[PDB]
Design an enzyme around this catalytic site. Structure first.
Site, PDB file in Angstrom:
ATOM      1  N   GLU A 140       6.379  23.391 -11.000  1.00 11.74           N
ATOM      2  CA  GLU A 140       7.356  22.449 -10.459  1.00 11.74           C
ATOM      3  C   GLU A 140       7.460  21.421 -11.580  1.00 11.74           C
ATOM      4  OE1 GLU A 140       4.745  24.003  -9.034  1.00 11.74           O
ATOM      5  OE2 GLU A 140       4.142  22.922  -7.222  1.00 11.74           O
ATOM      6  N   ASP A 162      14.134  -5.187  -0.470  1.00 15.05           N
ATOM      7  CA  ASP A 162      13.652  -3.834  -0.278  1.00 15.05           C
ATOM      8  C   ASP A 162      14.743  -2.953   0.257  1.00 15.05           C
ATOM      9  OD1 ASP A 162      10.203  -4.424   0.666  1.00 15.05           O
ATOM     10  OD2 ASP A 162      11.214  -4.095  -1.256  1.00 15.05           O
ATOM     11  N   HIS A 166      -3.455  -7.045  -0.608  1.00 16.96           N
ATOM     12  CA  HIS A 166      -3.381  -8.302   0.128  1.00 16.96           C
ATOM     13  C   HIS A 166      -4.549  -9.240  -0.085  1.00 16.96           C
ATOM     14  CE1 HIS A 166      -0.431  -6.620   3.398  1.00 16.96           C
ATOM     15  NE2 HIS A 166       0.092  -6.639   2.183  1.00 16.96           N
ATOM     16  N   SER A 213       0.315 -10.187  -4.851  1.00 17.07           N
ATOM     17  CA  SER A 213       0.845  -9.274  -5.851  1.00 17.07           C
ATOM     18  C   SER A 213       0.767  -9.883  -7.231  1.00 17.07           C
ATOM     19  CB  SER A 213       2.284  -8.917  -5.515  1.00 17.07           C
ATOM     20  OG  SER A 213       2.386  -8.683  -4.128  1.00 17.07           O
TER      21      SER A 213
END
Ligand SMILES: CCCCCCCCCCCCCCCCCC(=O)OC[C@H](COP(=O)([O-])OCC(O)COP(=O)([O-])OC[C@@H](COC(=O)CCCCCCCCCCCCCCCCC)OC(=O)CCCCCCCCCCCCCCCCC)OC(=O)CCCCCCCCCCCCCCCCC
Ligand SMILES: CCCCCCCC/C=C\CCCCCCCC(=O)OC[C@H](COP(=O)(O)OCCN)OC(=O)CCCCCCC/C=C\CCCCCCCC
Ligand SMILES: CCCCCCCC/C=C\CCCCCCCC(=O)OC[C@H](COP(=O)(O)OCCN)OC(=O)CCCCCCC/C=C\CCCCCCCC
Ligand code: HEM
Ligand code: HEM
Ligand SMILES: CCCCCCC[C@H]1C(=O)O[C@H](C)[C@H](NC(=O)c2cccc(NC=O)c2O)C(=O)O[C@@H](C)[C@@H]1OC(=O)[C@H](C)CC
Ligand SMILES: C/C=C(C)/C=C/C=C/[C@H](OC)[C@@H](C)[C@@H](OC)[C@@H](C)CCc1oc2c(O)c(OC)cc(OC)c2c(=O)c1C
Lengths: 61, 146, 101, 48, 380
Positions: free
Chosen positions: E272, E229, E202, E206
């Site tokens: 994993e 979003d 911020h 962006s």
């Protein structure tokens, strides 16, 4: 005209909009669940305890 | 005034034969445009939702005066007539106008403004250093609820 | 041998920023120097650069480009900032080394 | 090894159906709102 | 004073300046939802996590059978479990792309925003590590035994540093408990750091595809990016559920369905999936320390990218050369991963050692180089 009749009576007043969604979901739930279960059950006829059931549920003894 | 919103703002109902342009115009410093607009669009909303009897009572009395002040002298009158016949058909006397006004009350204003302002896609005109006020979408959203 | 020229002219068409109608210099990443360069631009050459960008953005958000016709041609790209920038840098380098003295 | 199995899949169905509908519905809304910016047009008219 | 509450209120003022009136570039692409989606993963792990912890029983003798119990007996527990588990994977997915984006559009120039990111990533990895050990399955165990042991590589403090980790002198209960406690805590630390990540962000607004000042056309975060979003929400949310409703154990090794055995390391033990790439690098350096070190930098190198930026331009949008390199690197990982899943033999071993050589070089050498070269071709 439904879209007019609809927008004019339901979607316009932000307060009725809600009642529509609520009352709507409500109907939507029932119909959906019913068909859903249906679509599934059928796609699996004779394999579910709902089908085999009768052979033992109050059949012997 | 309270928040030094605009240098000026004004209501207007430009009418035409078949159409019209009901709205408002304000001029302010680059850095308040928003808050301003906001309060404005609010008023519109408040108009279509909670206008009171006391609010209309005044307007009426205010309107009556301009009604009269439009007919202050020769030219003015002549204009009114020139334009009365040309647009309204005949001549609308003050005695008449007045009835039509003493008629209007709260309920009416609400219904009427709602009729033309609520959830309608509006027309926007911006000129100058307008960075602060943005997105029609947002301005649009300012057309309902409040 | 035009090799070098033939190449630059290539990479240029390759980068293809000119498809957005942007000038080479239009793309420079805005660092502390550039920033100063840009502040030195004459007002016309500046508002212009800006619009060129605000247009590029409008494109990039629509996922489109300019009709081939309006693409920027290698030889016509105007290095409007290159010189300004260089000076800036020069000035600095002098200030910089002068503080080591 | 996994009794749930059935219900797991029954849900999976419902899940897919709602997800088909919901995803679709929102796509509209995402566009609807963005339309403003998609259709948008601009031009540079310096003064003379 | 102020007119609309939304701007004055000490709290709303916040919700506002970061979800509604927040200035967003008009052109940010799909690759920009991954931040928020990552969020959603975090929110979904913490939620499902609390729930699973309500039934877990951190204790060797019961740790396994508690999960089992939690899946079979607890209402919808299974669904919870499944979600938590694949959530993890989907988390890592989202995070790897979120990083991707960052790399290709040089968002890494927002240094702090970036550094914190690394931190977050690192943590997630750690977090996800302990989480796995909990179920106390074969993998759970042995993974615990390896990963921790890694620190035995550090001289002096080393052999001791492990001591703590395990709380014993071998991986036993004490580990399992403190690991649970740790796994329980950590997620929260991420949540916190994220708050920071977003703050540093911020400060600059962006980035954006073209890599040029967006100030000339910004748009209120709402409704634009807000709606965007939600769409991106359901979109990812789909395969996630799909995956977790129809093939829960697809992404998951089944050797972990066999309670840990302190005495038998499964013949076919592979990490994993989201760790495979690193696994590979370490597996190609045949030296305790080297292996460990290779791995270290395998991730720690991220911190460097910001200094290994040489292009006069910011994003690779206009650098065909860099691009090609980039993708080669993507694929370079995509390879390294494969190898991980492949036993230690030929060709695999050498193929591995290369990709690793591959990896580091693209990042430490080609990138900055193709970058410089690039500006001379534009003539800067
Ligand atoms: C739905 C996908 C959109 C389809 C598309 O590409 O539109 C082309 C086209 C519109 O063309 P266009 O105007 O040139 O494209 C505008 C945008 O690309 C139109 O796209 P958009 O900008 O409006 O939507 C962007 C969206 C699009 O995401 C996708 O591409 C999918 O990405 C996101 O919102 C992020 C979600 C990412 C989560 C994925 C989870 C990863 C897990 C992997 C396992 O739509 C159609 O052809 C209509 C289809 C009916
Ligand atoms: C028994 C049956 C079940 C009962 C259900 C309980 C009912 C709950 C009441 C909900 C009240 C809804 C009223 C909201 C009205 C707000 C509003 O202004 O409209 C929506 C307003 C937009 O306004 P406009 O469309 O431009 O027009 C306004 C109309 N003139 O907000 C929106 O954007 C609506 C979009 C909503 C969908 C977004 C959510 C998507 C999420 C999906 C994931 C789902 C699964 C997981 C959820 C689990 C959470 C723990
Ligand atoms: C890590 C180990 C795990 C394994 C790696 C997982 C890799 C997954 C496979 C790749 C799937 C992604 C699909 C490819 C997308 C292709 C595409 O859209 O490319 C074109 C498109 C256009 O760019 P512009 O020039 O700006 O255009 C603007 C004007 N129209 O480029 C992009 O979308 C940018 C690239 C997005 C990032 C994707 C990177 C994939 C992830 C890998 C991890 C990489 C980082 C290294 C981290 C170290 C740990
Ligand atoms: C819990 C951790 C993380 C979450 C949930 C998170 C969240 C966010 C959010 C919300 C954004 C804004 C939206 C977007 O640009 O995608 C963002 C931006 C950013 N994040 Fe993350 N992030 C995480 C991890 C990381 C990691 C590991 C990195 C890489 C080190 C990173 C690098 C960045 C950068 C560079 C930006 C700037 C993006 C831009 O150019 O607009 N983030 N992150
Ligand atoms: C950063 C998010 C988190 C990650 C990455 C994550 C990941 C994991 C993983 C991979 C497992 C092993 C699951 C399996 O058997 O496949 C796990 C287990 C577990 N996690 Fe998490 N977890 C996270 C947050 C949480 C939260 C918020 C809690 C509670 C503070 C929690 C509680 C548990 C518990 C009780 C288990 C044991 C049950 C099980 O194995 O599923 N987790 N976690
Ligand atoms: C409650 C109000 C506070 C709200 C805080 C959350 C917030 O601000 O949510 C936003 C949508 C934020 N997203 C962005 O800023 C954002 C920026 C550019 C593009 C997109 N999307 C597409 O281009 C974004 O979605 C984003 O993803 O942050 C979460 C990570 C935050 O959550 C956390 O930090 C928590 C874990 C704690
Ligand atoms: C209490 C907390 C402690 C002690 C901290 C832990 C720190 C470690 C890192 O966290 C950031 C770690 C998760 C991260 O390393 C960078 C991973 C990429 C490591 C990947 C990894 O996995 C393996 C694994 O999963 C296994 O099981 C099936 C077995 C394994 O080999 C036999 C490995 C292995 O050889 C490696 C390198």
């Amino acid at each position: 005209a439904l879209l007019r009749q609809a927008y004019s009576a339901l979607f316009r007043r932000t307060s009725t909009f809600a009642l529509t969604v609520v009352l709507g979901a409500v109907l939507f739930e029932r119909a959906f669940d019913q068909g859903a279960d249906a679509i599934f059950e059928h796609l699996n006829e004779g394999k579910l305890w709902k089908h085999i059931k009768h052979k033992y549920e109050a059949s012997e003894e | 005034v309270e928040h030094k919103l605009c240098h000026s703002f004004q209501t207007f109902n430009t009418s035409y034969s078949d159409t019209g342009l009901f709205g408002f115009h304000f001029v302010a410093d680059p850095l308040s445009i928003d808050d301003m607009m906001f309060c404005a669009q609010g008023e519109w909303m408040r108009l279509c939702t909670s206008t009171t009897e006391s609010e209309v009572k005044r307007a009426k009395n205010h309107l009556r005066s301009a009604m009269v002040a439009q007919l202050d002298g020769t030219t003015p009158v002549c204009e009114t007539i020139g334009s009365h016949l040309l647009n309204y058909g005949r001549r609308i006397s003050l005695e008449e106008w007045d009835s039509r006004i003493s008629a209007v009350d709260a309920r009416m204003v609400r219904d009427v403004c709602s009729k033309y302002i609520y959830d309608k896609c509006p027309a926007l005109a911006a000129v100058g250093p307008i960075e602060q006020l943005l997105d029609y979408n947002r301005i649009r959203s300012g057309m309902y609820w409040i | 041998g035009r090799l070098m020229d033939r190449i630059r002219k290539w990479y240029y068409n390759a980068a293809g920023f000119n498809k957005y109608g942007l000038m080479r210099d239009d793309t420079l990443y805005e660092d502390d120097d550039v920033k100063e360069a840009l502040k030195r631009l004459p007002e016309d050459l500046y508002n212009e650069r800006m619009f060129r960008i605000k247009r590029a953005l409008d494109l990039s958000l629509k996922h489109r480009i300019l009709p081939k016709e309006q693409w920027v041609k290698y030889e016509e790209d105007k290095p409007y900032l290159e010189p300004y920038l260089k000076e800036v840098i020069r000035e600095r380098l002098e200030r910089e080394a002068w503080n080591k003295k | 090894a996994e009794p749930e199995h059935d219900q797991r899949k029954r849900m999976g169905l419902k899940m897919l159906l709602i997800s088909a509908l919901l995803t679709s519905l929102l796509y509209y809304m995402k566009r609807h709102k963005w339309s403003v910016l998609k259709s948008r047009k601009m031009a540079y008219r310096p003064p003379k | 004073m102020a007119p609309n509450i939304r701007k004055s209120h000490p709290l709303l003022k916040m919700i506002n300046n970061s979800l509604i009136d927040l200035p967003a570039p008009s052109n940010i692409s799909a690759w920009w939802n991954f931040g928020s989606l990552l969020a959603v993963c975090l929110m979904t792990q913490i939620l499902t996590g609390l729930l699973l912890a309500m039934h877990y029983t951190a204790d060797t003798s019961l740790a396994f059978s508690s999960v089992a119990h939690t899946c079979r007996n607890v209402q919808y527990g299974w669904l919870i479990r499944n979600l938590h588990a694949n959530g993890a994977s989907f988390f890592f997915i989202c995070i790897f792309l979120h990083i991707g984006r960052g790399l290709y559009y040089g968002s890494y120039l927002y240094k702090e925003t970036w550094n914190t990111g690394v931190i977050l990533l690192l943590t997630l990895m750690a977090t996800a590590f302990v989480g796995y050990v909990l179920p106390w399955g074969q993998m759970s165990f042995w993974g615990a035994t390896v990963i921790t042991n890694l620190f035995s590589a550090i001289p002096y403090i080393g052999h001791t540093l492990v001591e703590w980790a395990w709380g014993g002198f071998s991986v036993d209960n004490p580990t399992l408990t403190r690991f649970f406690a740790l796994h329980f805590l950590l997620p929260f630390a991420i949540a916190g750091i994220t708050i920071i990540h977003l703050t540093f962000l911020h400060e600059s607004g962006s980035n954006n595809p073209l890599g040029i000042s967006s100030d000339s056309d910004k748009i209120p975060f709402h409704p634009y990016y807000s709606f965007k979003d939600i769409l991106g929400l359901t979109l990812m949310l789909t395969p996630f559920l799909t995956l977790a409703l129809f093939s829960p154990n697809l992404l998951g090794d089944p050797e972990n369905f066999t309670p840990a055995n302190p005495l038998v390391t499964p013949p076919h033990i592979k990490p994993e999936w989201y760790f495979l790439f690193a696994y590979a690098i370490l597996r190609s350096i045949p030296n305790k320390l080297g292996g460990v070190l290779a791995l270290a930098a395998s991730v720690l190198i991220l911190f460097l990218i910001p200094f290994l930026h040489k292009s006069k331009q910011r994003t690779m949008t206009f650098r065909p050369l860099s691009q090609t390199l980039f993708w080669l690197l993507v694929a370079n990982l995509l390879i390294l991963t494969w190898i991980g899943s492949q036993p230690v033999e030929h060709p695999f071993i050498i193929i591995g050692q290369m990709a690793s050589l591959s990896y580091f070089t693209i990042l430490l050498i080609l990138f900055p180089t193709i970058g410089t070269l690039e500006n001379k071709m534009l003539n800067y």
